[PDB]
RNA sequence: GCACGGAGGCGAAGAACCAUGGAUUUCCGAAUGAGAAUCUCUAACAAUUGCUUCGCGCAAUGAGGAACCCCGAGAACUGAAACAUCUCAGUAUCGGGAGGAACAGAAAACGCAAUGUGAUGUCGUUAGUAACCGCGAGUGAACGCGAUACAGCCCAAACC
RNA sequence: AUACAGGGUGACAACCCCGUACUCGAGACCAGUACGACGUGCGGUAGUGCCAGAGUAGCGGGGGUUGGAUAUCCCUCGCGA
RNA sequence: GCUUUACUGCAGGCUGUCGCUGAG
């Protein structure tokens, strides 16, 4: 079986998102849906998930840029990984 | 051209084959990537 | 290696799926650090990480769980 | 004393005298509205179904079968061809159509082999045939120190490979003595010249 | 159909089927088209029944004819199961004979009439 | 108007494609045909015997 | 691993490596819920069949494989110093199908005619003989014999 | 040396290493075969025209095929014990 | 490749006959 989140995609443009706009961007299973990258990122991390957007890159691999709400920090869910 | 998510898997992995045979393999092997395609002289499949 | 099969056999099916989630998460954030081109790696052990997963899994097919 | 079935024999010699040939002209009408194979509860020459191997038991099928009647349906040469090849009217198969049939039978059915045939008449341009299949799967066939032969796996698709009754005699191998040596082990094997 | 000359009303049938469940009881009865055609060509049979929903019809054409140039008396019946069910079988019956009637060899005697009188 | 140079301008057609099947870029998305392996025509594989020596 | 780098790691809890057996085994693919250029849409033996508790409940088929094998369809260049019959050749190629081998096979045979042989393949021979043929060019057996290997049986029906 | 087959090893190696002769073990095939055994019952006389496979055997038309010639094998149309 | 009252054949069309096919 395979699992929804791959791991986080770490990159200049990800770090804005986060400090600026407190989201996440991870590397998911091309299969998963953004509902399932929204749960499995709520169990994860213990947050609770905004919005979540995807995008299936020229790396072969599916994007999600997950906002997490107000009551989250991103710059601290990430600093612990 | 509108490319599907099958196709974009594809030219993802051509673009990958696309790399040089790293420095490290040299050395490994004490001593050519013969799959170089340039997108202009080469011509994919599909 | 830190983790051998004897071992595995010697825990409780509910003892393996709490390892086996508990490897998981090391193994996901060995990814973490290593997606961060973070270098306090140890290559020897993500490796192993998927290694014990795989016994585990092998265990609980072996055991009926 | 003479078998009921001697009867139904005796009646099948002359099928245009007769009852029978008056059944045949009745039969004839809803055959011709039939299909190409239609299955049969009950064979229409039961001492010929049985003297061919039928029984009255589970996995024996059998069937009727509709060709049309004459030579070869044969395309006429679309490039250069010698006279003696242009020919298009007078060639004819060399399977006759019975064979057509066991095949047309066995294809509708895929699991099940062809043990026989016979032939049940036929009009201005049909020929019917029915014919015996048989379910080398079930059991109490399996079971059938008779028919258990068929079970094996040397005899899938017996029919296309001309292993049947009437796929021998079209083959030229009736006769153990002469003229049969062209013919025997095998067609192929002879060069193909029978 | 092609070998029935004459149709039998439906209560000369029963008259005639309860006969035969009596015969199989107090006399002989052959059940089966072979052995039914034996009967008559070993001369053992006294009345002979046919099915006429017998499909196909070969397997009986010859009854009629055969019983005629035997003497033997002979009648129709509509239903093939009904005939095998009155023979004592679990299963249908394309033709019966009954070989001795008992304690019917009267009211048997006498369907035997009223068929040959039902010419 | 050339049919040489100047007609192989209008070419701009996809026809042949990556099979499913096979892999080779031979289906033909309009006709949904291999011309490699006959995937799409037949479920047996597409094959000949003159792709080879006669004796071979 | 090929693959001889860098870093790190595993192994006396006997690793590497080898044998056997077992686990896992994405998507397309006969491809079978339906559609699709390997993805997608809302439970599936799709299709054709046998049995049938008549419910996909129990089963079968499909496709592959180096050639070999069996059954069907069947050229021409060429040779004949042209060319039609003939030849190339039942070859090439095509359709269908089996197996580890196929096919054949226990005489309505043979016919060294006999007071004789005794299922069937195959090998050697018989023989380029008999037979065919614009009687041209060409084509071309069999019985028998010597070997190989050997093996003989079951229904339909009569009577039950 | 029952081992002087072959290979490797910083140059031509029986004696440096692998191996080789000898002996031994295992798997696969032979084969679910042969042998053994269990059950079944073979055979003979006399009498009896009870049974023994039909579009068949066979004939004719037309084609194909074959060395098959009148005397090959097959298909088709018609007839048919 | 093409043509025709070149040679030989082949489709196809017309026509007789047999089968399907029966009653007075
Ligand atoms: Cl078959
Ligand atoms: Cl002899
Ligand atoms: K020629
Ligand atoms: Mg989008
Ligand atoms: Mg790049
Ligand atoms: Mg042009
Ligand atoms: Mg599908
Ligand atoms: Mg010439
Ligand atoms: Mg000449
Ligand atoms: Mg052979
Ligand atoms: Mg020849
Ligand atoms: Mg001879
Ligand atoms: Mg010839
Ligand atoms: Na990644
Ligand atoms: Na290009
Ligand atoms: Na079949
Ligand atoms: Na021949
Ligand atoms: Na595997
Ligand atoms: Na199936
Ligand atoms: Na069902
Ligand atoms: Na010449
Ligand atoms: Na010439
Ligand atoms: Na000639
Ligand atoms: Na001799
Ligand atoms: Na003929
Ligand atoms: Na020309």
Same mark, same amino acid.
């Given at each position: 079986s395979w699992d929804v989140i791959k791991h986080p995609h770490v990159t200049e443009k990800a770090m804005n998102d986060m400090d600026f706009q407190n989201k996440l961007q991870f590397a998911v299973?091309?299969?998963?849906?953004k509902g399932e990258v929204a749960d499995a990122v709520e169990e994860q991390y213990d947050v609770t998930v905004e919005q979540v957007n995807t995008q299936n890159t020229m790396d072969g691999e599916k994007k999600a840029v997950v906002r997490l709400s107000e009551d989250d920090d991103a710059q601290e869910v990430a600093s612990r990984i | 051209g509108k490319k599907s998510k099958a196709t974009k898997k594809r030219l993802a992995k051509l673009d990958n084959q696309?790399?040089?045979?790293?420095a490290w393999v040299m050395l490994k092997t004490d001593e050519r990537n013969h799959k170089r395609r340039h997108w202009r002289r080469n011509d994919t499949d599909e | 290696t830190v983790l051998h099969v004897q071992e595995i056999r010697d825990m409780t099916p509910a003892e393996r799926e709490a390892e086996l989630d508990d490897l998981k998460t090391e193994l996901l954030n060995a990814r973490a650090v290593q997606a961060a081109?973070?270098?306090?790696?140890?290559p020897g052990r993500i490796k192993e990480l998927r290694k014990a997963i795989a016994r585990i899994k092998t265990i609980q097919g072996e055991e009926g769980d | 004393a003479r078998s009921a079935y001697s009867y139904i024999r005796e009646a099948w010699?002359? *099928?245009?005298?007769?009852?029978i040939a008056e059944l045949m002209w009745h039969r004839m009408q809803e055959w011709r509205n039939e299909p190409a194979v239609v299955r049969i509860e009950? *064979?229409?020459?039961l001492d010929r179904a049985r003297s061919l191997?039928?029984?009255?038991?589970? =996995?024996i099928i059998v069937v009727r079968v509709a060709i049309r009647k004459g030579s070869s349906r044969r395309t006429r040469f679309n490039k250069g061809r010698r006279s003696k090849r242009?020919?298009?009217?007078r060639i004819t198969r060399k399977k006759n159509i019975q064979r057509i049939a066991e095949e047309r039978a066995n294809r509708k059915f895929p699991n099940l082999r062809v043990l026989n045939s016979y032939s049940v008449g036929e009009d201005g341009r049909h020929k019917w045939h029915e014919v015996i299949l048989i379910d080398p799967d079930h059991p109490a066939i399996k079971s059938?120190?008779?028919?258990?032969?068929?079970?094996?796996?040397?005899?899938?698709l017996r029919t296309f490979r001309g292993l049947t009754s009437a796929g021998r005699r079209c083959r030229g191998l009736?006769?153990?003595?002469? =003229?049969?040596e062209k013919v025997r082990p095998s067609l192929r094997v002879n060069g193909a010249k029978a | 159909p092609v070998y029935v000359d004459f149709d039998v009303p439906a209560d000369l049938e029963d008259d005639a089927l309860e006969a035969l469940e009596v015969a199989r009881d107090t006399g002989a009865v052959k059940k089966g088209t072979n052995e039914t055609t034996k009967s008559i060509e070993r001369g053992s049979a006294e009345l002979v029944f046919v099915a006429e929903?017998?499909?196909?019809e070969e397997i009986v054409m010859h009854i009629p004819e055969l019983a005629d140039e035997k003497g033997v008396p002979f009648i129709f019946v509509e239903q093939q199961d009904d005939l095998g069910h009155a023979a004592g079988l679990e299963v249908g019956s394309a033709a019966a004979a009954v070989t001795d009637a008992g304690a019917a060899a009267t009211v048997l005697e006498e369907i035997a009439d009223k068929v040959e009188e039902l010419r | 108007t050339g049919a040489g140079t100047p007609s192989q @301008?209008?070419?701009n057609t996809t026809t042949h494609t990556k099979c #499913? #099947? %096979? @892999?080779?870029?031979?289906?033909?998305?309009?006709?949904?045909? %291999?011309?490699? %392996? @006959?995937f799409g025509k037949s479920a047996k594989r597409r094959d000949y015997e003159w792709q080879s020596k006669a004796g071979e």
């Open positions: 299973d091309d299969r998963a849906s | 696309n790399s040089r045979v790293p | 081109g973070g270098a306090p790696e140890n | 010699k002359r *099928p245009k005298e007769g009852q009950r *064979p229409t020459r191997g039928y029984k009255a038991k589970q =996995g242009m020919m298009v009217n059938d120190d008779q028919l258990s032969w068929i079970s094996r796996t040397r005899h899938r009736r006769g153990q003595g002469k =003229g049969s | 929903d017998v499909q196909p | @301008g209008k070419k #499913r #099947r %096979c @892999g080779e870029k031979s289906y033909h998305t309009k006709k949904k045909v %291999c011309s490699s %392996c @006959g």
